[PDB]
From a paper:
Aminoacyl-tRNA synthetases (aaRSs) charge tRNAs with their cognate amino acid, an essential precursor step to loading of charged tRNAs onto the ribosome and addition of the amino acid to the growing polypeptide chain during protein synthesis. In general, aaRSs are divided into two classes based on the global fold and sequence conservation. Crystal structures were determined for a CysRS from Borrelia burgdorferi bound to AMP, GluRS from Borrelia burgdorferi and Burkholderia thailandensis bound to glutamic acid, a TrpRS from the eukaryotic pathogen Encephalitozoon cuniculi bound to tryptophan, a HisRS from Burkholderia thailandensis bound to histidine, and a LysRS from Burkholderia thailandensis bound to lysine.
B. thailandensis is commonly used as a model for B. pseudomallei because of their genetic similarity and its far less pathogenic nature. A comparison of the human and the B. thailandensis HisRS structures reveals a backbone RMSD of 1.13 Å.
Author numbering:
A (entry chain A): 9 to 124, 128 to 281, 286 to 409, 419 to 439
B (entry chain B): 8 to 60, 67 to 122, 128 to 196, 203 to 214, 219 to 280, 286 to 409, 419 to 439
Amino acid sequence: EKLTGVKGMNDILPQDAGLWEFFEATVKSLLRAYGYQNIRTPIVEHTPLFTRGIGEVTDIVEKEMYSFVDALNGENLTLRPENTAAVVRAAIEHNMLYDGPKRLWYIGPMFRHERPRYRQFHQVGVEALGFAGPDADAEIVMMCQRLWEDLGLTGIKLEINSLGLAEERAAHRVELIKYLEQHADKLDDDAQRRLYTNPLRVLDTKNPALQEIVRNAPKLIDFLGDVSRAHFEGLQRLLKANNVPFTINPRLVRGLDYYNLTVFEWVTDKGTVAAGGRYDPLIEQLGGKPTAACGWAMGIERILELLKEEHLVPEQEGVDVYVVHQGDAAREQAFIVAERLRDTGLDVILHCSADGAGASFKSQMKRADASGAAFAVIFGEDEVTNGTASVKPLSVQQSVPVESLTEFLINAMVA
Amino acid sequence: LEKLTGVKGMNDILPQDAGLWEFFEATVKSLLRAYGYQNIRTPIVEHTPLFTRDIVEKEMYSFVDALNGENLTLRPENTAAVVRAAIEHNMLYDGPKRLWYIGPMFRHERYRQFHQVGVEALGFAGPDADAEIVMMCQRLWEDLGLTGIKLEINSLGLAEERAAHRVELIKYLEQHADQRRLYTNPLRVLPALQEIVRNAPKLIDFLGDVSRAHFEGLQRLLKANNVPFTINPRLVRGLDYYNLTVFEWVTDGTVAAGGRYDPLIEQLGGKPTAACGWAMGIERILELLKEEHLVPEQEGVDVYVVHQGDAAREQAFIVAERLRDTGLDVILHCSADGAGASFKSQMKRADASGAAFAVIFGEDEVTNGTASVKPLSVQQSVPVESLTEFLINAMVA
Ligand SMILES: N[C@@H](Cc1c[nH]c[nH+]1)C(=O)O
Ligand SMILES: N[C@@H](Cc1c[nH]c[nH+]1)C(=O)O
């Protein structure tokens, strides 16, 4: 009886690997280019980390985490839905901020029961821990822009917003509720549920009849005091100074309650591809010295789909040589020369047959073609006896003294 | 307000360890390309029955899905999941496949989260493929700089041979009243008891000629390629899918382990075939690289941009971006408190960063249209439009 992979948890197969490899190489290089350094936290953490970090009022913590209890230990555990809180957890646990702020990046799988596509998905993300900003905020937004350029993607647009501080949120909440209450007759059931608990999430509505209402809602940005406005405006100053286009979207709210001040999204118009923001309260909330922080994450799969849609999938890398052989004597030689060629820095596949028995030259040569190899290096009885290797570019097949094969191949790749 | 802790046995990997991981990952990934092996990534969880078909008994993190009720397990291992994808996606339709994987694995119980890199040669009868994958391990040690890692091999033959061996082992063990485990798990019975165990019937003497030919052919290839080895007949691995070739790489403990497992594919519902592979615990190899002092040096960025004044900070920002456009790695000074910092403090950060240069902007630099560059010679003024050529030139030495 055949088994299947958990629905919403895809395998990544050799045909897709190159595309992942391109993305990973590109972003990892960008990350180095800004001085960000890798941190890797576990796949599981204690459940309370997410409940306190992300917030009991959110769909993630309520409806969407994979949580369970450890048999032997009775520890409560959850597969990470996200990595910011875990970074905070490691920063606090390991005293990372003793000697100053830290530029951190991470990459790996995350988990979520969502309505539709991916219950296992992958993020790359950054955390700038200990920086008040708004310079740090500008930096991390810029890191995203550079990634699009480096990847070849165009038409990704930045929207920003401020959630201000707690008191300013509270004042705003009041007038928003007072406003939304005026139109309770037209609110849907999802809006009603959220009205008195997280009304900001009502502004995000997709409901057609609510659009003109939500667009005229009281804007959180109008309740920003001096410190907030200065931060938000200073972020905008830096972005302008670097010619980064953007729109202010006051309905931009994220599905994690740790955010304050800056929030931002990168969005494609045929949706969100990168998202982040500042979250100064979080470190204290998880028991740490009060500390400012901002960061972002990207859903890789969603960026990969974009690269496919826009035809930016690079060509499969092939190996340099495919070693073809018949005979016991030839196979030993094929092994030995395969190894020498690799010692030289070449990529080499040595023919091995599904069924164990030697194989026909024609079948091996078909495999050689399919492999993307540039040369077939061929050993039969004559070659073994004469001390040669027969090389065929994938021109005409050529005999070469085996002791010269390396120079021969190197030379020929000069082309 | 209470601090939260990392799950015991699940270590964080922090920046100061990352380079060591990066070195290992880069080295092995390059070796894997060099043999034509291609990445497959399976999920962290699978349906529990996959692993059922000590490890399975005590050692898996299993649980029940709250939404759908389905039974799920954090993978303890990756071979079965590779087989699961190969079957699910019809990977062997057009021929055999050379696969590698890397990622975290989980064991309920020094590491409860640990990491493996491994290979599966799916669809190859061998023993050529067996030789290849063993040889891949040897190359990795050389490339990593590790010495004194030794290969032991063994055959588990086929089921009937395994069974026949059991008989004579029990018959032999029965002759030495010197008892609970004799009838139950006699392999686990192999002090003054050494001379007895050392003369126990060896599984290798019950290999029929299909088995012997495979094992002997593996030995042939290994000898021809100058891979030394010892036959260790006490070598058994901790899962019953292994058939024929089994092998371990050991440091005088096991650092790589693998073998052939032809029955497994059919057992998971696939067209009958052959397969062999291996896996390595990364953490164990990393400890070795530390012990033998093969930890490479941390690499630093090329430039640290230092500034004071509002005008200077904007410029610092813009130039940091231009320098990165040109291929340099750059850290832009940003302060905890958001405002400026002292030249001395910034310069301390510049030093600690491993940057090769501090590029400095104050009000004079902004006005004059210059950048002040200090190697980490003396501090030198340069037209900002030339900073790139300046820095590149300076690094060529
Ligand atoms: N962790 C957030 C993004 C983020 C990173 N840093 C701050 N916010 C998410 O999963 O969307
Ligand atoms: N999966 C095995 C090793 C292996 C890979 N392929 C075959 N065996 C392990 O975890 O030890």
